[PDB]
Design a binder for this molecule. Structure first.
Ligand SMILES: *[C@@H]1O[C@H](CO[C@@H]2O[C@@H](C)[C@@H](O)[C@@H](O)[C@@H]2O)[C@@H](O[C@@H]2O[C@H](CO)[C@@H](O[C@@H]3O[C@H](CO[C@H]4O[C@H](CO)[C@@H](O)[C@H](O)[C@@H]4O)[C@@H](O)[C@H](O[C@H]4O[C@H](CO)[C@@H](O)[C@H](O)[C@@H]4O)[C@@H]3O)[C@H](O)[C@H]2NC(C)=O)[C@H](O)[C@H]1NC(C)=O
Ligand code: NAG
Ligand code: NAG
Ligand code: NAG
Ligand code: NAG
Ligand code: NAG
Ligand code: NAG
Ligand code: NAG
Ligand code: NAG
Ligand code: NAG
Ligand code: NAG
Lengths: 525, 49, 123, 102, 50, 49, 33, 39, 32
């Protein structure tokens, strides 16, 4: 059995007093006119989903419904037996069908009636709102509006995915789910919420929320924007099976002197950077270009590894904006350098050692020696590798182990071409890119077209259909019927009338002309 | 335009930086682009007059 | 990671032997292939090293001009052909995954013959 | 660079020291130690003179410099009764004679 | 949970510098006919001021 | 509005942060509020016309 | 929480806890046992 | 004359006038003429 | 070429048993 939740499931979103005001807030509320499951206690204690939070309501005569169990495997136990409310988070053993008769991290001890509750779990806190009110109705939930107040807030840190109710045996109840919807809450003169608008229920509610009013005057209003959503994603990278020789840079037997640093070129390979970032062998791992955890999603036209030995106190000089004995004379980085500087202590590898010597960006100008000894930290040798990333939108050759997909065309998709992402429809192109051009650009510097990373063909990118959404309505004093115009779109992805102004849904197309009342556009009213 | 950001392309900021750093680069673009719209609208209002 | 090789063979002096090796569980082109021989009653002798990435091959002076190494990345295999055999060449020939020299750059690494196969006896 | 390492007689539970000497100084990061059980291929235990190879028990440890390096076993197991070899690989590839542990 | 800040008495119908549980400002405190819910300590205006 | 500040309420910034940090949060509110007045005044000037 | 409000206070306990394998490791404020 | 222009980057563009600053040969510049006759 | 080379002068190479021109670049803005 199921019922109509009507306007139930609203609560005071915070602990602030307000009056004579319409307040807009986004929180987990029961959607208006939602579908809620109807349970009975006649002649029924199932395990139900918790999802993002649960709306619970019950109608009582003899106080049969007394509690709930929340958790995963089914643990938070809430029971109201007589006058003593008991809340526990303990490793209690439950039955396959728990009921009442007519290791702990937390513990607390304190139809004729309608009892409403809201149960939501945010950042480890189990928040309970409630309201009690007298009723005179057996058949179903009463229709009407009331806002629930916060009562209990349990600092547990509990994972809740499912819950179960508790009945006393010798009382119907309803279960709904909360959604992150915006509501316009109407506070009367005494600060009581007396009404509410569900901003994602229908186009009239959207208009009421947009105008921050429970009354809408006759006319046409722009309340939202229509956007076609992607159905699937596309991940494209060159089909390269060779892996990048980072091990040959970092695990090298010997490193070069700082005055004569080595430069190893990395290309046409799969670059797994999780090894370098997660490894605990490094004393420092500072990125100036991109975050170290994004390295396996984005990719480069090339990577260069600059390998050399410095003193520990010289580590601070290998950075954009720095100056000094190394930064100015031995190894200079661009102040707009893109890349990561990785270094580690080599005291047990290099020290004895006078074979290491020191004296524009990336200049190798070919004189003093270092005295590296095992008993020296600031004067101990460090092995430093600088990974210079050319991340300009050129053909990529050095990309991480990101799983690829096939290519989907003539549909709205979420695409990734060599680390470049966006949403749009991929179509056939008659454009010809030069051999060195991987991406094209529009006036806004957005991607216009791409060369497919695996196939040497050009795809045009046409961002998914969108436009403003306007609600056409008579004043709410006469009617709550509305019609909706989807601006500058076809009657495709969206009693339908196609006009030059867009796709008009809900208005009847009439052959007889009339003096203009509510204008739509392009000769249509 | 970058407006001081590492890139004028929003997706290039998001795909490269974690939120603690990405948000800063985005704020730079929001200020510039919001300011651009305000400049545009003011000019449209005066032109409309 | 596992390495497997061909079975045992018997050859007369002046003959040649083609010793094969197959491997799996790792990126083939990231690691080289090293060959080590062990004559009965003897210790280990290095014969050579081949890059699975570019064909760069190094040999022990003892086998320069006697041994030809080659790889095939499409089957994840490597081969070592020993020409002009002598009775002096009796040994078990072992194939090992190498992280002693870089597969891409040819430079010395900190590591060794990290994963050895069973080895094959050639008389 | 020729390496020199005949039979070490020790009971299970005793500490073993296995020596390797080079005719020339070698890089401290280019020494590897192997363990070969009879009838089996050798396996890598220690690399870079002192670093422990993946899958190798903590009872194995190495150290040294110049021309004098060692491999030690804190406590011998019945599974350690194998021939241990030292490998020099900074300048060409050389193996030592091999030390038998009983 | 509040620190060891010395309290004062309550002064009404005069311009005062007030501190209510850490919330501060300047204004005149007067009698109210408003009723806060049991869990509401502060009220707010359109500017989000007290 | 916060405009990037830890609070839209000036007294809540001042009562929580020492000057070396409070001044930054305040500058965020000053820019937003000064910009708001400039937007308001421009609209009032055009409307006045 | 990335919007965490509070203070993180810590001190060396080398002369209190160290000997010690009785300390173990594996959403905001999640206590996953 | 008008020689010494090149594609400044690796981006495809069409039907557009693009302004860029880079190292280009100045138009109508004075260039030295060398020969391989009878350098 | 990722070289790190200091270039201040250059020289051409001809095969002996073909005119050529040398100009210099400047940081000028062009409308392309
Ligand atoms: C530089 O060389 C370092 C050493 O390289 C190894 O030793 C040399 C001699 C050769 O044999 C070489 O081929 C070897 O790889 C290298 O460090 C190594 O990095 C890898 C990759 O991260 C590590 O592998 C992971 O191991 C953990 C388990 O670690 C524990 O157990 C070992 C037992 O030996 C202990 O030594 C450790 O201290 C820990 O107690 C696994 O859990 C992990 O599995 C996960 O990742 C794999 C990826 O394939 C997935 O398939 C799984 O599902 C998991 O998601 C890995 O197997 C390796 O342990 C580590 N070795 C050492 C000694 O630290 C270093 O990365 C090289 N540097 C560069 C830049 O390449
Ligand atoms: C709830 O959904 C079920 C299944 O589609 C349907 O039969 C029932 O009538 C719906 N109830 C309400 C109140 O919408
Ligand atoms: C209610 O249940 C608790 C156990 O959870 C028990 O200790 C308490 O005595 C009960 N109260 C009554 C009135 O039975
Ligand atoms: C209580 O939790 C600890 C967690 O370390 C576990 O070892 C113990 O067995 C648990 N006891 C019970 C009764 O569940
Ligand atoms: C406010 O409460 C009073 C009773 O104190 C009541 O008479 C009045 O009607 C209430 N106002 C509203 C808007 O409900
Ligand atoms: C290049 O060489 C010239 C001398 O011919 C010198 O003056 C100049 O500083 C050098 N450039 C760099 C970057 O060292
Ligand atoms: C992708 O694979 C095809 C073979 O199916 C190959 O022809 C093509 O060159 C590959 N693309 C790249 C960029 O390597
Ligand atoms: C608007 O609705 C109210 C309430 O029903 C009614 O009293 C009023 O006369 C209506 N006004 C018009 C213009 O219909
Ligand atoms: C809508 O698409 C159809 C093809 O399915 C086309 O014939 C029609 O002209 C299009 N209308 C508009 C307004 O784009
Ligand atoms: C208008 O009348 C024509 C017949 O003359 C008919 O075909 C058409 O469908 C009618 N359109 C509407 C909106 O009534
Ligand atoms: C909660 O439990 C589910 C399995 O029922 C698991 O997938 C989810 O990740 C857990 N949540 C947390 C925060 O660990």
């Amino acid at each position: 059995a199921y019922t109509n939740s009507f306007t139930r499931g609203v609560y005071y979103p915070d602990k602030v007093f307000r009056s004579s005001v319409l307040h807009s807030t986004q929180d987990l509320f029961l959607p208006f006119f939602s579908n809620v499951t109807w349970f009975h206690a006649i002649h029924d204690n199932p395990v139900l989903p918790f999802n993002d939070g649960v709306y619970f309501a019950s109608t009582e005569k003899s106080n049969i419904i007394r509690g709930w169990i929340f958790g995963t495997t089914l643990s938070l136990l809430i029971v109201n037996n007589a006058t003593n409310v008991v809340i526990k988070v303990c490793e209690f053993q439950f039955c396959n069908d728990p009921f009442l008769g007519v290791n702990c991290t937390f513990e607390y001890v304190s139809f004729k009636n309608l009892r409403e509750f809201v149960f939501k779990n945010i950042d480890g806190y189990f928040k309970i709102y409630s309201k009690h009110t007298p009723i005179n109705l057996v058949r179903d939930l009463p229709q009407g509006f009331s806002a629930l107040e916060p009562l209990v807030d349990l600092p547990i840190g509990i994972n809740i995915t499912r819950f179960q109710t508790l009945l006393a045996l010798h009382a119907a109840y309803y279960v709904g789910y909360l959604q992150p919807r915006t509501f316009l809450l109407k506070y009367n003169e005494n600060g009581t919420i007396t009404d509410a608008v569900d901003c994602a229920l229908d186009p009239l509610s959207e208009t009421k929320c947009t105008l921050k009013s429970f009354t809408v005057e006759k006319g046409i209003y722009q309340t939202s924007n229509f956007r076609v959503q992607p159905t699937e994603s596309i991940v494209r990278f060159p089909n390269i099976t060779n892996l990048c020789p980072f091990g040959e840079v970092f695990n090298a037997t010997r490193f070069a002197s700082v005055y004569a640093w080595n430069r190893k070129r990395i290309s046409n390979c799969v670059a797994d950077y999780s090894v370098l970032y997660n490894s605990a062998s490094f004393s420092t791992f500072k990125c100036y270009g991109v975050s170290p955890t994004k390295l396996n999603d984005l990719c480069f036209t090339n990577v260069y590894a600059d390998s050399f030995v410095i003193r520990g106190d010289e580590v601070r000089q290998i950075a954009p904006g720095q100056t000094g004995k190394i930064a100015d004379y031995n190894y200079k980085l661009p102040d707009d350098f893109t890349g990561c500087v990785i270094a580690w202590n080599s005291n047990n590898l290099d020290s004895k050692n006078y074979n290491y010597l020191y004296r524009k960006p990336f200049e190798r100008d070919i004189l003093q020696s270092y005295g590296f000894q095992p008993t020296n930290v600031g004067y101990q040798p460090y092995r430093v590798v600088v990974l210079s990333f050319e991340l300009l939108h050129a053909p990529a050759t050095v990309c991480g182990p990101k799983k690829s997909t096939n290519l989907v065309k003539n549909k709205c998709v979420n695409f990734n071409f060599n680390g470049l992402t966006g949403t749009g429809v991929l179509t056939e192109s008659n454009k010809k890119f030069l051999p060195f051009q991987q991406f094209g650009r529009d006036i806004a510097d957005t991607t216009d077209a791409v060369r497919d990373p695996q196939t040497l063909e050009i795809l045009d990118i046409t961002p998914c259909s969108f436009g403003g959404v306007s609600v056409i309505t008579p004043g709410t004093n006469t009617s709550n019927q509305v019609a909706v115009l989807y601006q500058d779109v076809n009657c495709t992805e969206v009693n339908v009338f196609q006009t030059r102004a867009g796709c008009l849904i809900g208005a009847e197309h009439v052959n007889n002309s009339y003096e203009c009342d509510i204008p739509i556009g392009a000769g249509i009213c | 335009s970058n407006f001081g950001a590492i890139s004028s392309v929003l997706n290039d900021i998001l795909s490269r930086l974690d939120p603690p750093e990405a948000e800063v680069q985005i704020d730079r673009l929001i200020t510039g682009r919001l300011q651009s719209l305000q400049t545009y609208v003011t000019q449209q209002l005066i032109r409309a007059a | 990671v596992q390495l497997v090789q061909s079975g045992a063979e018997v050859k007369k002096p002046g003959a040649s032997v083609k010793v094969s090796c197959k491997a799996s569980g790792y990126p083939f082109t990231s690691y080289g292939i090293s060959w080590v021989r062990q004559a009965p009653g003897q210790g280990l002798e290095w014969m050579g090293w081949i890059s699975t990435y570019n064909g760069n091959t190094n040999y022990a002076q003892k086998f320069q001009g006697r041994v030809t190494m080659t790889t095939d990345t499409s089957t994840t295999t490597g081969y070592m052909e020993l020409r002009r055999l002598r009775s002096d060449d009796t040994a078990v020939y072992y194939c090992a995954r190498d992280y002693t020299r870089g597969a891409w750059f040819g430079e010395s690494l900190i590591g060794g013959f990290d994963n050895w196969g069973q080895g094959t006896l050639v008389t | 660079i020729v390496l020199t390492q005949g039979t070490l007689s020790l009971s299970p539970g005793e500490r073993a020291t296995l020596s390797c000497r080079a005719s020339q100084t070698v890089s401290s990061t280019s020494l590897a130690w192997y363990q070969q059980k009879p009838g089996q291929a050798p396996r890598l235990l220690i690399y870079g003179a002192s670093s422990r190879a993946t899958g190798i028990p903590d009872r194995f440890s190495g150290s040294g410099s110049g021309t004098d390096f060692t491999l030690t076993i804190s406590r011998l197991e019945p599974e350690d009764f194998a021939v241990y070899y030292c490998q020099q690989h900074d300048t060409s590839l050389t193996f030592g004679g091999g030390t038998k542990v009983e």
